Amino acid sequence: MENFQKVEKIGEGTYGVVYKARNKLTGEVVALKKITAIREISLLKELNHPNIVKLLDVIHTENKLYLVFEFLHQDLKKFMDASALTGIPLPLIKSYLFQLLQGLAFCHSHRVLHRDLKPQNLLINTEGAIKLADFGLARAFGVPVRTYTHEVVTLWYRAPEILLGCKYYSTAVDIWSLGCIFAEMVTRRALFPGDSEIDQLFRIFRTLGTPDEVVWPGVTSMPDYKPSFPKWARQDFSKVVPPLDEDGRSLLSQMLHYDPNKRISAKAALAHPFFQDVTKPVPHLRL
Numbered sequence: 001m002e003n004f005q006k007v008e009k010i011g012e013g014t015y016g017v018v019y020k021a022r023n024k025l026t027g028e029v030v031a032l033k034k035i036t037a038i039r040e041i042s043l044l045k046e047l048n049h050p051n052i053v054k055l056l057d058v059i060h061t062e063n064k065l066y067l068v069f070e071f072l073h074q075d076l077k078k079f080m081d082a083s084a085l086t087g088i089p090l091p092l093i094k095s096y097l098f099q100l101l102q103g104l105a106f107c108h109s110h111r112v113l114h115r116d117l118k119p120q121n122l123l124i125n126t127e128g129a130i131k132l133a134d135f136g137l138a139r140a141f142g143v144p145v146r147t148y149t150h151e152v153v154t155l156w157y158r159a160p161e162i163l164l165g166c167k168y169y170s171t172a173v174d175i176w177s178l179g180c181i182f183a184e185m186v187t188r189r190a191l192f193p194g195d196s197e198i199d200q201l202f203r204i205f206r207t208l209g210t211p212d213e214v215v216w217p218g219v220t221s222m223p224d225y226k227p228s229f230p231k232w233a234r235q236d237f238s239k240v241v242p243p244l245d246e247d248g249r250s251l252l253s254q255m256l257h258y259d260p261n262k263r264i265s266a267k268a269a270l271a272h273p274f275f276q277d278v279t280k281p282v283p284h285l286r287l
């Protein structure tokens with residue numbers, strides 16, 4: 001750690017404080033995060049793609065663990081808050097979604113999951129890129145109920161199979177999260193802002209209908225499924241994400257399928273007609 005000068009605290013992550021720092025040698029500006037786990041993290045050093053924030057190095061000293069990452073100036077949460085009045089233009093939402101799906105397709109091809117996608121770990125630069133931060137850390141360290149600072153780990157983007165107690169969930173959990181984020185960029189409001197596991201589950205059911213054996217074979221057997229869940233009818237997507245066009249609503253509906261085996265994959269999503277006219281606009285960033 002003596003090789004880094006901390007510039008400023010840039011937030012509190014799931015696992016510890018996150019700092020903007022400078023390599024006392026190369027002058028490189030990085031994000032420094034204080035955190036079997038060693039081997040898993042070490043492997044993430046090779047999982048490189050332009051839409052995944054680069055893991056530069058791992059430092060383990062005095063039984064302390066520090067991860068050094070490529071630095072980006074802003075997160076999607078702050079960008080959405082700043083874009084609240086007029087909303088993020090559809091072409092930029094589309095570019096971001098397209099880029100995030102490329103990041104997921106790459107990681108998923110290596111069987112690596114994120115498991116905790118949310119606007120705070122989607123990072124953007126001045127060039128119109130967006131990247132996924134903290135990919136793979138969940139498997140290495142787990143996803144706690146509260147962060148190191150006791151902050152509640154959000155449930156808003158959590159897939160229903162996780163909430164229903166599936167032990168061996170898949171890459172589909174990241175597609176669900178990203179679908180939730182897509183809807184939030186379009187409407188300017190979180191899709192399912194649950195404040196407990198049951199409220200999260202019931203918010204999903206109110207919008208998508210209570211799942212049953214017809215739409216999700218096997219759901220009634222899952223560990224935390226209860227026959228006493230209320231039965232809500234499914235809403236039309238035209239009501240849920242106006243004024244998104246039919247191509248976007250079609251893709252969203254596929255990213256939010258209940259049955260993880262039938263939920264669209266990142267690779268298939270990239271081929272969806274919604275991306276026929278995709279471009280890469282540049283956002284207006286005020287740093």
Ligand SMILES: Cc1ccccc1-c1cc(NCc2ccc[n+]([O-])c2)n2ncc(Br)c2n1
Pocket residue numbers: 010011012013014018020031053069070071072073074075120121122123133134
């Ligand atoms: C992903 C995450 C979760 C929680 C806290 C920080 C982070 C977080 C935030 C950023 N940059 C955005 C930012 C925000 C505020 C000030 N400055 O200078 C930059 N970065 N940049 C690379 C990583 Br890797 C990272 N992780």
